[PDB]
Structures are given as C-alpha cells and as structure tokens.
Ligand binder design. Structure first.
Ligand SMILES: [Zn+2]
Lengths: 94, 237
RNA sequence: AGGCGUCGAAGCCCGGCCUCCGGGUCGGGUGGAGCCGUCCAUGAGACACCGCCCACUCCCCGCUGUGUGGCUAACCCCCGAAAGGGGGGACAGCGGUAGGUGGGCAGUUUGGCUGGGGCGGCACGCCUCCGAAAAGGUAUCGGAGGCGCCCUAAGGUCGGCUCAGGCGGGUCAGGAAUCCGCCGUAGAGUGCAAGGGCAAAAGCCGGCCUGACUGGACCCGUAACAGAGGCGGGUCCAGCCCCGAAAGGGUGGCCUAGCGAACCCCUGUGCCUCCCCGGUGGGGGCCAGGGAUGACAGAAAAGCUACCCUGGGGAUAACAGAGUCGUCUCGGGCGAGAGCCCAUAUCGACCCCGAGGCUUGCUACCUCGCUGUCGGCUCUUCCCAUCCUGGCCCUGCAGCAGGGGCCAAGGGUGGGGGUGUUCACCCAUUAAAGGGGAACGUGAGCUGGGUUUAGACCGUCGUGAGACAGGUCGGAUGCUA
RNA sequence: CACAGGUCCCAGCUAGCCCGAAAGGGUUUGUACUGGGGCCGACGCCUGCCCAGUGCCGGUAUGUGAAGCCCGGGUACAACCGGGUGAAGCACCGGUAAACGGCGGGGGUAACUAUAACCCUCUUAAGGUAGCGAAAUUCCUUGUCGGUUAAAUGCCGACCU
RNA sequence: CAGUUCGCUCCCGUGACCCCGGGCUAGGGGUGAAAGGCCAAUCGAGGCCGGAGAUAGCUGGUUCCCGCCGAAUCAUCCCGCAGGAUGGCCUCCCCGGAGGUAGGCGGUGGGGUAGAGCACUGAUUGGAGGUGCAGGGGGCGAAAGCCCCCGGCCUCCUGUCAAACUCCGAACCCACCGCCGCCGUAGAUGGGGGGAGUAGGGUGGCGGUGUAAGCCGUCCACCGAGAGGGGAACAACCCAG
RNA sequence: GGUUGCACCGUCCGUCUUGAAACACGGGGCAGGGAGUUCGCGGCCGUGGCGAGGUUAAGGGGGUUAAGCCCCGUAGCCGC
RNA sequence: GGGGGACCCUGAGUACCGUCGGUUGGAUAUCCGGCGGGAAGCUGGGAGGCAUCGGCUCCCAACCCUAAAUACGUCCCGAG
C-alpha cells in the first residue's frame, strides 16, 4: 500500500489547512521509572511463582498503522482518525 | 518416589553399617615419634585371619614393649624379627622411610603423609614399585597403574601382601556368596533397577528397559546418579 | 609565498636505525654560503614556517585489573592429654550476592460441542443464498459457498463516452493482431464470495483534490418482541477545506465480512497534580492513536492409570428388554430368456409388492443407593417356514430312484476327532441324523475352558510413565426358604 | 525375583557415591585382588554395521552470555541511558554403542518361463551379518507339505511369504 | 472351630535351614532375593489427635390449618453445557388520571409461500429449417482445395423439470386509520418498588432431516400443575374445566 | 358407636423424573430428639417521634436489693 | 536562689547509604534481619510520605525504670 509522504490537511493548532508530513511512530521499550514497571519489579522479588501472565507467540498477522502528521508551519504533530491494516506500507513522494 | 539403596546407605542404619566388632582392630604404624631417628626391632608373635581385611594380619611385640597389629607380608615367619626405622636393613617385613628404599623395589602400606599410619596398597596380593628418589618427592607406581608422588619421609614396608590370588577360585555357590558378603554386612543379594518399579528407580517400569541413556551427568543431584556416572566411553574397546 | 642559514647552508664517506630495501630520518667527519616555491600540473599544496590532529609502535613515572611462579604469617588437614611436630596454603572451607544446569523434590494445568465417550471436524468470531412456513422470529455434526485482505487509488468531486456477443467488409492478417458499418436491456463490468443496485452510470477514459480531517449531538443493528460492555451503521450542528458555472456532492471503498475488554506499556497534545512553603530532576492524572487475547464477551498450561479412590448419572455406552426392519430369513406379481418345438417339468434375468422378528445395525424409551457373562452338562415346555416317519398333486414321473408342491407337529432327529467354542469341517452308522422361541430358557442347579481386574513374557507403537476389539501362563463362584 | 559367571562406568583418600538445616556422619578398625554405581545372567559356540538423532566425556580458537567493575552522557547528588571487560552454560569441533536406540527404499536386474542368486547406483549414518522362523513373536491363518487318528482349529519335522 | 480354619494329596527337610531372648532402622520415611510387597486384622504413602462444623455446581432431608391469584424449561453472555447472570412469563404494594384493543367490518400499504409457468439461470426426448463453425472423420484431389456425413451453435414444433429459477401468484399474516363489540373513573393502557420460581419438558398438527423408529424447530391446543363422565384398562383422544 | 353383609367405585406413602402401582430409590412397629440461626453492611416496605434539621456513641451524675428508672453527654454520622 | 562566660561534657561498626530475604495499607514514601561500606560528635546532630538545594517549624537517637485506667477466670459472692 502506497501512501503520500505529505498531505494538505486541517491543523488543530493553526486552525486551517496546512501541509503535513507523514510519520510512523517508533515503538520504545518499557520505562523502568514508570509506576507500573516499578510495581512489577517490586513484586518479582523474593520467593514464589511467576506473578503475571506469559503470552507466547500471540501476535496479529497484520498490525494497525500508528501514524502521526506533523505540521510544516507550527511543527506540532497530531493523529488523523484510527489506523488501518495493510501488510505493506510504503511512503511515496507523490 | 522412594529412596535408592545408595541413598539409604548414607543414613548409617544397621542394614548398611560395618560390623566393626568382629575384626582384629585397626592396622596402623607406630607413632612417628618412635620411628624417626631411631630403629626398633620387633618379634612376630602370631599370624591370624582377620574376618574383614582381605589380607592376613600379624601381631608384633616391640623391644620398647608395644604390641601392634600389622599386615603380614608374603613369606613372613612366626618368631621372625622385623625392623622399623631409618636404619633398618632392606628386607621383607621391615618398614623404611621412602627415601631409603632403592628404586625398583616392591613396597606396601605406604603413608599418604608422614605419620598418618599408612593408607595405600593394603589389600592382599598387591604391591607398589618405587620408581625414582628425589630430594623433594619419591615417585611410586601403584596397583592401579598411577605414578604418585610421596613426601620422602613417608613410611612404607617392603614386600607383598599375603593372600593374593583369591579371584582365581570361583565362588560357585550362592551360599558361598552369602557367607562372603555376610562376613562384611555388604548389601547382598542386589536388585535390578530396570525390574524395579518406576517409583523406586529412574529405569523402572513395566517394560524392563531404561527409557533414557544410561550415562548420567556428573552434575546430576543425589538420587539420580545411577548406571554409568560421568563415563568417558562405554562398551567393548 | 616567503622561509632557513657564523641564530653556520649546498655536494660526496661511511656508522646505528625504522621501513611499501618506496623512499625518508639521524651521530661523526673534508666542507665554508648556499637550498625549495609563488611560477605550473594534482579533485584537494608545499617535504616554506608556525599549530590541533587521526593510523601502528616503544620507552620513563603513577594507578588499575588478569594469568603464571615462589613464600609463610591467616586458614585447613594429620600425630599427640597438652606441649608441640608434620603436610597443604592465601587455594580450600565459610558468609553474601549474580547466571546456568536441575522430575532429585513440589504446587499446578492438560478447555468445550459431540445422536455415549475417544479419533475426526469446528456447527467455538464473521458475510451471502436456500432451510424459513409471501410481516418479524425460528434449530440440528442441516444444505451451497466465502472472510482474518487489498486499494493515494480500487477514495471525493466535475466533464465526456457506452459494454459482452453476433453479422457483413477489409494488405501482410488466418480461429484469434488493427480497423469500418449495423444489430445489441446489459446476455459486459464493479478489487475480491454470494445476493441486490447501477447504461446521457455507481461501468470506461480524463482534470483537480485529500471529507480516509477536527470539536460534538440524536438514532437503528449485533441483541425483533425484551435487558448490554465493545463494535459497526444512519441523520445532523460547528470549524478548516476539495470538486463544480451552479444547484448539488464529500465524516473512505455502490449496501451487506476483512476483527477484540480490564491492567500494563509506547506515542501525540495541551492542562491539573506530588503530604509545611519555593526551585530543579523524576513520578502521578485527564484526552486522542497503537501493541491481543482465533477457546475470537478476552486463565499463562503435556500425558498414563489394568494399583486406582470419591460424589453422581439409566440426563449417557457394552449384554439383555422395548420401537424399526436398512440388512437378515422366507414368500408373492410380470415374464425376457434357457429348456430338440414348449415361459411356467425345472431355472427364471431387468423391475415391483409383502411376511417374521430366528443375523447384524439404528434409536436411547425402563433398568448404573448393583437384574452376575459366552460355552458345556441337567431338566421342562412351545411354533411350523417339516429332515425322517403317515397321506397326496404335477413332472423333461418306464422300474429303482430324483426335481417342484400340498395336508400333517403324534414320535424321532443319535455317537465321535481337532478347537473354550455356538457355528462350520471331517469319520463310521442311520429312515433322518430340521431350523428356532422360552430374560440370546435354565449359575438362591452345576462346571469355569473362553471373556473382563490385580502377577508375568513376547511382537508392535510411544523419549517416558504406558498402551494394544494381538498372542501367551496363572488367577475366588456366599444361602438356616 | 535372586544366584555363581560375563562385561561396563567413577574413584589414589581431604578420593568416588550418599544422609543432613548445620554441626558432623555412612561406605571406614576400609585403601584398586578395594569401595561405590548399571546391564546381562550356569555351561558350549559366538556377539556383525551405524556417532546423523538423544545422552555422556574432552577441547573451546570464535559468537552470545548475569552481576560486579571501568568509561562517556544525565542528575547541584541518584534514579536512568550507551559502550568496554566478561565466568559457567549454549553455539562450534572431536571421541564414545556389552550408552538410549536404528539397521528401509527404489533404478534395476538379464540369462531358462517364473527364479534372479552372485552383481552396479542414489535419497539419510547403515541398510539385518552368523544364527533362529506360522514361533509365549505370524494379521490373512485352521498358511503349505509330511507323520500321528477312521476322522486332527491339536502336537512333532520341514518350507520362508 | 476360624474377620484365612480343617481333611486328603503335595513340596523342602545339613542348609541361602527352622525357632527363641536382648537390641537398632519410623511415614514421602523405614525395609524390600523387586510382588507396590511388608511396616500391629489398616499401605500407590500407617495410626492418633488438631486445622475442621474443610469444600462440591453432586446425592438425600426440611415438621400446623384454611383463604386469594398463579408460572416456566426460551433469547443473549460465561473453561458455559447436571451450574450461574440479564431478560421474558407469576405474585404483593403504591403513584397516574382518559384511555386501551384479544375478536370483527371497510379502507390505505408490505409480502413472494402453496399453486402455476418457461419470460432470465440452470436441466431435458425426438423431428424440421439455417449456419463452415479452430468442430472432427471420410470420398476427392499433390494438394491448394472442394463433395459427403457426424458434431457444435441459433429459430420452430414435439415431450418433460427446479430448496439454493420466476413473466405471473393466492389462501393468509403484519402495520396504520374509521367504526361495531369488549374492558376502564368500583381506576384500564401505562410508571415505580419488594419477593420469586423457571435454563431436562411430553403428546398432538406443520416444516427440514432420517429406511423407519428417532433427532431438530415451529403452532399453545391438552398432561406437566387438572377433578368428574366415556374410549376395557390408557397422560396426551371425546364431553368437561 | 363396634363388627360385619350387599351394590358400585378405588392399582399404598415420600422422592428425582416428560412420565410411578412400577421389575426405579427411601419405607418391621412404637415412644422421644431432629433441620432459615447470630452478627456486620446495604436495598426496600408497615408504623411512630421530631423536622431544615435528626440522632446519639464511649462515658458522667442521681436513685435503687438490683444491670431496672431519671437527667446530662454534639465527639461523631446522615441531610441542607 | 539568682545573673555572666570566651573553658569542658552530652551514648559508634551507631545513625546513615547500596543490595538481598521476610513483613506491612505503607504505595520510588512501613518495620525487622543478613552481606558489603560507614560519619559528625555542640563552631554539633535528627524529622517534616520519590531524590536533592534553600527557608521555616518541631526535636536531641544509638542506656535504664515506672502505679491507675485493660486482658483472663482455674476459683469466690450475686443474678437469670
Ligand atoms: Zn500547524
């Protein structure tokens, strides 16, 4: 699936239609400073069995696209609706 | 599951304990303070059969008045005179420091360290060969075929242990085996793990065959070391 | 673009040296005044000079760890009451911490539907047609198929055009290349299954564009009537926009599938907040998008039990009973044909209509707080679709015998070999050595050989515990009516 | 089941194997003709091929590999992020089958008709040798032939599918 | 006689033999010539007491009378299928005040079943006519070709079809409006609250499935939860509540 | 009122179950015992007090043979 | 009994930091214990719910004792 690299669309901050670059969100590892990770590491310590579920090989064949659109004028990013599912995602300058 | 015979042996129950009251006593050398820098002569008084020793024993009465039990070497004579010390003649029945035994001689009852009392080569029909004599160590070839280094001051006796050749004659009878092993309280008769129950042995089961390779790792925990333990190889070479 | 030089330079001699022995650096010595480039070539200029450097290398000082060798003084081992002596030795042992291995030892899981259960399959999440009974709804391991995608165009809008197939005519050119005329209600096409809808289009070819957007309402469906987290769809208000002359159209794909809670985490975007106040780092919170649970309204999860135990179930199997007769056994209708001619002496194709409950099967209606199995022995009784014994009819019935059929159930229908066998096969006799019902008659009558526990062996399958409607040896039968 | 006999494995002593929370202890008043651990199982003749798979043993140049330590960033200090060092273990290489276990298939085969027997070649490590065979192993099965009986789902001998 | 005995028969009887007294090994432990055997009539983990009145969706039981109304076994969800929750159906109390509709007549709309039919899509016997049609095979001819048939494709006639066909099409069912009838101010339609039970249904008519029995839905009539009079007895059939 | 005769009718009791006289389970007789209890929280209804207020808790005093009886007790809780 | 001082004293393997186990509502912010580190000490030190800096407030650990209001009933009066 081809997708334009840039598109003209509404900007919540400029309150008008401006040129927006198309970007893909880059997934990041869990932060060890977060409260959830802190609690997980706190309960992992000591004796006992594993305290959480351990899913194995539980992945969707195709994942939805998590795209952000950045305004070329104000430089802020936003989301445009909900993502869709395509196995091949390509960005074309058109 | 249940315990193995080897595990149960570790608890020292009467089923597995040595009956160390039928025997003639412990066989150890005279204290090193008597042997060092002084040679004593002793007279052999009697030669006896120790129930569990695998070798005959003998009583020696020393000049100083000490009565001791020793492992009689082949050819020892009742009423014979033996010597223990650094200045004793090289002969059968005499005990010398390892540094004073010419190379190529057969010795028995070798002390691991000077004065311990003798630990090596005490079974009937065994001997060790004195190979080399160095200021720091004396090399001796043991019955297993290993060249071990001993401190020069270790004490050993010249000759061979009497009673060799037993294995030439078959036991023939299960009753003969019964008496032999009862003399020492060694576990007999012995069962087979493959014909044991699965609860009792790793190889147990209704189908009489091990379900796993019989070579067990050296890192296996107690209750798992059965069969060939840490075997480099198996079969007929 | 000038720099060096008694602030001692060119041109030869060898000495040590590194090194692509390219070629360069340098101590000593006769030496006593000269040597490069701006000039040009090189993509990038000076071995003119002043500086930070990168690429290998060694050396002096300081620190830091690793490996090896050695020492004894901690520590360990032996002798000895002790004294003390000997051996090992900063290892080992011990304490703390970090990873691996680990059925040696434990707690657990190993789902459900199911014409019993298991194997099989998913009827376990969705979409179309029929079932479905002309409003709505309606089930089965009912029938026939599809989905777990793809598309920056296959999305929005505006303009223009009309398809499949056929006929007649044309250079290569034929069945099919590329054309010209006519007929042509869609017999074409739609991104994809099916259904429906679409012809001056929703199809085909072009122009511009991103409404496949932001902040929110009400309503229908999943889920009728009649409750719903999540999800999908419809009608609108505002913002900023796309197309068009304008009306008018645009909140993805012509409508119906292509997907998913809590907790946690990632990202965007602005705000609130963190224990007496204030700042900094960091944390928490509200809103939006995303990572998946297919057992698809969302536990993370392998088997044996024949040593088994418990609570139940005739809601559910094996024997027997009950319903049915597909199958089984036994009759009938028609008559092609075979029988020297002759359909019916005898056989009787291809078709069709029945009887019994004596084989097997199907169902799951009674019986799982217990109705003891196959076979044999003993004993009693009944049916005729009759094997012999009594009496008859037809005959392709000379006699002796045969083939078909009718009435007839009073009597008989026996003895042995292998095999647990019923049965079947075989032997010698006989008039014949008929088939069946009675809880597959009969274990409060017997026997216990087979079957179906607990022991054991072989073959095969399984890593294993084990399993085998595969063989094989052994394996209890209660009673005072 | 055991048994005498066979053979394999660990261990030179503060060992090997084992009980335990530890202290200490069993084998041990022991010392390789010994102690401990498996399998077969008197006696006679013999025990063939295979190390790819699982297991065990040795090496481990190289990759990965936890904490600790070091370096840079970050924090007025930490939390935190990136890199270096990196043991055991795995990856990797070799031995090992009286360790667990395996020892098929075709292309074919010709000469006489079947037979195909010697015999040559490929999938993966090798393609079942000496022996025994309808067997406590054989489905078809009451296999076939011979003996035993008048009659043989039995028994004995043989054949090999 | 005995919670393992008695008789006959049988086996060992100088050895791995039989027995006695004093000792040690204790429960995931002991002991075991290996049978999961034995460990005080108990052993695939002993006995005693305590946790403990353990838990179970599984089985059984639950005690006085009369009076009034009176069900359900069917939809969605659950490791759900012998169990639960939300609904539907029952009962009791209260607010509201002017309507409501099980039956019928007429009208305005919707439908695609039974039946029928070939106008589409797919099947179907034969005959006639037209088409060289990549058919195909033969006669004919060195070769290019014609002439025969058979086949394919169209029109017609003839003889037959469809749960996943329809050019047509009822009975009949549903929504709404007017009216008759009935109910309702002694308070309906409707709204709020309290308490449930019900999640195995059966017979009968119809539809899909099956050789049939049967299985699975649908219709709400009867038994379940129903007396009396009959069918000889009979759940379900007739009269009757 | 006890027993008995005649005519007609009538296949016990409890229980699971669609279905019980059942060849389905519990049923020799009699007497006695025997199974929706208590607390905490919450939703409702029947009645009574007060009312933009309501109500005390622990505890204190008086009196009493007595734990009965009288008064105080606003912390606290709910509502506005 | 009161005023002044510029001199002296005021608890160490302790407080505290890192890590591991247990425990706790204690949540980066409960308490106890092990291991490895470890001060100031009056010109001093500690607490104020993640860490650090400044202000403010409140305190002086690492030594010891303490009646009454309370828990119980083998037992004794009294009551239902
Ligand atoms: Zn902007």
């Amino acid at each position: 699936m081809k997708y334009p690299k840039q598109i003209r669309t509404y900007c919540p901050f400029c309150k008008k239609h401006t040129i927006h670059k198309v970007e893909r969100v880059k997934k990041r590892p869990r932060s060890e400073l977060s409260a959830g990770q802190r609690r997980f590491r706190r309960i992992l310590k000591g004796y006992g069995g594993f305290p959480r579920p351990k899913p194995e090989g539980r992945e969707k064949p195709v994942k939805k696209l998590d795209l952000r659109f950045r305004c070329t004028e104000c430089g802020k990013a936003h989301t445009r609706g909900r993502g869709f599912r395509v196995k091949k995602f390509e960005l074309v300058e058109g | 599951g249940k315990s193995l015979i080897q595990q149960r042996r570790g608890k020292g129950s009467p089923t597995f304990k040595s009956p160390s009251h039928r025997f003639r006593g412990a066989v150890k050398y005279i204290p090193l303070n008597y042997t060092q820098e002084k040679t004593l002569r002793g007279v052999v008084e009697e030669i006896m059969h120790d129930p569990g020793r695998t070798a005959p024993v003998a009583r020696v009465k020393f000049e100083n008045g000490i009565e001791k039990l020793i492992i009689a070497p082949e050819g020892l004579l009742v009423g014979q005179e033996i010597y223990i010390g650094p200045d004793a003649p090289i002969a059968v029945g005499n005990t010398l420091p390892l540094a004073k035994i010419p190379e190529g001689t057969y010795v028995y009852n070798i002390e691991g360290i000077p004065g311990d009392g003798g630990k090596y080569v005490r079974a009937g029909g065994t001997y060790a060969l004195v190979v080399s004599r160095e200021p720091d160590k004396v090399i001796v070839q043991l019955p297993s075929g290993e060249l071990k280094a001993f401190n020069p001051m270790c004490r050993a006796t010249i000759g061979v242990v009497a009673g060799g050749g037993r294995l030439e004659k078959p036991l023939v009878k299960a009753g003969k085996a019964y008496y032999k092993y009862k003399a020492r309280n060694k576990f007999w008769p012995t069962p087979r793990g493959v014909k044991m129950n699965a609860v009792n042995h790793p190889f147990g089961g209704k189908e009489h065959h091990p379900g796993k390779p019989t070579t067990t790792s050296r890192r296996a925990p107690p209750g798992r070391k059965v069969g060939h333990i840490a075997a480099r190889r198996t079969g007929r070479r």
